């Protein structure tokens, strides 16, 4: 028939060939048999957590670090150019001596 | 006929096979045989605490380690800026002498 949802139809059905073949028993039974699922919807749920985690906790975290990285840097560049200028000064006055 | 539940319905015709067939014992037995799982359902256990773990304990706290640090290279920005401002003042102490 196919993937058509409303299993309960494809119980009524072979509920229904059961009674054909006379089986009354396993033809009520079958028709009024209830499906129950197993705990397997904790994979899901933790699967589920896993990409939310994942996508908020790591990656943002990481373009937050690297931005304040950069800024970092551009901050230094002034101290490199202070200490050179630094250094000169100090060669100036030992050549003087 | 396909993945329905109750097994006990299926070992009630395989049951009805053996008597139609004439083994009574073996139809009896059968009938009233009842499975019974094994240990594996610690595995099952396990990789569910693997799942919770794996995301609770590692991501968030990768996510909090991440923005601590972008918060303290922010902070140290400030740093660079004053040892900037007193290696100038040095020099100009130094170009004085």
């Known amino acids: 028939m196919g993937p058509n949802m409303d299993p309960m139809m494809a119980q009524q059905i072979m509920g229904q060939i059961m009674e054909l073949k006379k089986m009354p028993d396993f033809a009520k039974r079958i028709r009024e048999f209830q ?57 100036d006055m030992t050549d003087l001596n």
Do not use: N
Not at 44 to 72: F, P
């Open 35 to 91: 499906p129950q699922p197993d705990p397997i919807a904790q994979q899901k749920a933790q699967l589920e957590l896993m990409l939310l985690q994942a996508q908020i906790e790591a990656e943002r975290a990481r373009a937050a670090h690297y931005m304040s990285g950069a800024g970092l840097q551009d901050s230094k560049v002034g101290t490199e150019q202070a200490k050179a200028r630094a250094l000169a000064s100090q060669a």
